[PDB]
Design a protein that fits this description.
- 3 copies of one chain form a homotrimer.
- In chain A, a hairpin with a 2-residue loop joins strand 1 and strand 2.
- Chain A has 11 helices and 9 strands.
- A 6-stranded mixed sheet of chain A has the order 1-2-3-4-6-9, with helices on both faces.
- Chain A has a single domain, classed as 2-enoyl-CoA Hydratase, Chain A, domain 1 (Alpha-Beta Complex).
- In chain A, helix 1 packs parallel to helix 2 and helix 5 packs across helix 6.
- By secondary structure, the first copy, chain A, is an alpha/beta fold.
- Chains in contact: A-B, A-C, B-C.
- The complex binds ligand 5FK (3 copies).
């Protein structure tokens, strides 16, 4: 009900189907996406294409099931080509970064608005981001909610190519003709670059402090009222 | 004496004021910067802009006439420790060349807004010196490992243009631009910023020298080549290196 | 017999001279390179230029003591890694497979306009050592490394310059003039910086799952299918076993 699944050649296309909420991840969508990734190998598919219906790839969230989704993607023997058709924001950016490769629409952008919201990310989100946009641009994205445009994303390697869903499927079909064991090996080693990192004690303290703070409430109220937030640092 | 401090909106601008030596660091200047970083939170500032007076951001280290030159490297370590530990984001307004200790200082900032005119350089290979591990790892994270090799192995200058390319510069801009950005950042959720800063700084750049590193670090600093480079500059002639 | 060694100023130029096979590595070529790197400091040189004769820098591994060859190759990298001399790779053409590994083991790279770099391992069903993957990642950026490794995509010289894999675009002559400058720098500064830069964590032992997948790749029928398909000029039909 929340995703579409089709297969052409040896490519499985999984489409996020909550366009009315710009494909925000809820429970049912996260669960169905998990099952789809897990069952992806059951037929004859050798590559996956992951994309969103409508104008957004994924506008955010709407932690346990979510963590299991990332685990399923990280553990999958098949390469996932993200056809990032539009904005990938927050949990949506996380999802885009968990893809093995990325084909990005010219109007798509990437963003962690966490500093606007008073929240804090897990270490993997931060490390994978630094690896993909470079540490310097990661600092700006993390510390000041900077948007990463399709064009800058191509410049840094966050986007592998700029193009359409059709382009992503053409590339996925090529990839599906390559040697699956070579692909599996390279995927495992690359994912084990150290991005998958347990929070240090001081990170967890700061994480819990941010999440449990009064500023989280102030950010929601100001955004809901479309007015500038008066944060307190508590 | 050697630094200026103003506050506007919620931005604390700290200005290195030793323009006669192109803002080159020594004992006193480093001490006064440390204090200013540490005190920066007392009022209601939520961001720091760090910049230099005149044509230079910081051209390195001088130490001649410095009564406590011996304590310089330790006080410099303390400055870096204070910037790392500071809850506020530091926006480096790199108004001009950042060389040696100045590039280190620029890299310790959280964000960088760079003058079209500025460049970054580690001239260590010209002087026979060796860098701490952090300097090498933070540079690699900022310019990419490939460019970091050319910078360290051949004293390659990094222009503002290429700095923007790689991410070393987040923006090419003036002090004014840096300050407007800092004003925006000072309006974001301080506790989110605190978390991200700590995680980002804990990427592993802060790394203890391995035993072979320390061995090579001491051979370089202890070498006659270091003396030769200083003499050569002073005599305005190419240095004749010996590898000892 | 299989390398050329010349010295001008304080720059030793080592030339891979097997152009008929696009400078592909075999035991004798690896052994002679190893010796040339090891003894490069015996005279008065303080910088090394490494380059290929003809159109290619190094197209890969040949073999056609070939069971005593992966060991010899590891030794070449060790000697390059341990060398006090900075090695400027003049990448005069394609660097592929073991050629790409060799190019990355260089301290700096000056790359010809028509040169490209490539790991075609996913086309052949093979798996790389961890270092090849980590060092590639550091040089082209994690994103591009993913495309190169999961899809065998080539990296052109212009993109190499963009990422830092190429420090400059230029000729062998450019690389030699650059090396002559570096040879006038302080050797102990260079030695330290090289050691730390190489000790970035790229020299990584394979994790358990890395080794499992690596052995499974190298022992698979798919390696065979890849070869037979090339010899039959036809699409491979891999089985994932
Ligand atoms: C194996 C591949 C893999 C599996 C999971 C992740 C991320 C995904 C991200 C999600 F997408 F789910 F949002 N995510 N969100 C929260 C967490 C998380 O790890 N929480 C524990 C924690 C406690 C305290 C603290 F301070 C920091 N972290 C987490 N892991 C990345 C890669
Ligand atoms: C936590 C935040 C933080 C604190 C300090 C640093 C750097 C700054 C740099 C300076 F800017 F000061 F120059 N710097 N310079 C020298 C050292 C240093 O630590 N020396 C001990 C040592 C001995 C032998 C060896 F081989 C290498 N290192 C050192 N630390 C970076 C981050
Ligand atoms: C100190 C500087 C240094 C020395 C050697 C290397 C690489 C070079 C590369 C070559 F260019 F030779 F091909 N190479 N090839 C194979 C191996 C290797 O170490 N294999 C063991 C292994 C076990 C399990 C597994 F899963 C993968 N590999 C290996 N090491 C890198 C840096």
């Amino acid at each position: 009900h929340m995703i579409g699944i089709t297969q052409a050649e040896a490519v499985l296309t999984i489409e996020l189907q909550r366009p009315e909420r710009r494909n925000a991840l809820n429970s049912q969508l996260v669960e169905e996406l998990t099952q789809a990734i897990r069952k992806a190998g059951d037929g004859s598919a050798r590559a996956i294409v992951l994309t969103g219906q409508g104008t957004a790839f994924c506008a955010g969230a709407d932690p346990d099931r979510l963590i299991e989704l990332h685990k399923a993607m990280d553990a999958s023997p098949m390469p996932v080509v993200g056809a990032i058709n539009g904005p990938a924001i927050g949990a949506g950016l996380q999802l885009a970064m968990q893809c093995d490769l990325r084909v990005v629409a010219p109007d798509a952008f990437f963003q962690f608005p966490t500093s606007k919201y008073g929240l804090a990310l897990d270490n993997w989100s931060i490390r994978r981001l630094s690896s993909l946009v470079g540490h310097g641009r990661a600092r700006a994205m993390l510390l000041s909610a900077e948007k990463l445009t399709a064009e800058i994303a191509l410049h840094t390697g966050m986007a592998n190519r700029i193009g359409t869903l059709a382009d992503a499927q053409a590339w996925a079909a090529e990839i599906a003709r390559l040697a699956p064991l070579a692909i599996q090996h390279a995927k495992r080693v690359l994912n084990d670059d150290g991005a998958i990192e347990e929070a240090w004690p001081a990170h967890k303290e700061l994480f819990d402090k941010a999440w449990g703070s009064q500023d989280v409430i102030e950010a929601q109220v100001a955004r809901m009222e479309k007015r500038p937030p008066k944060f307190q640092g508590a």
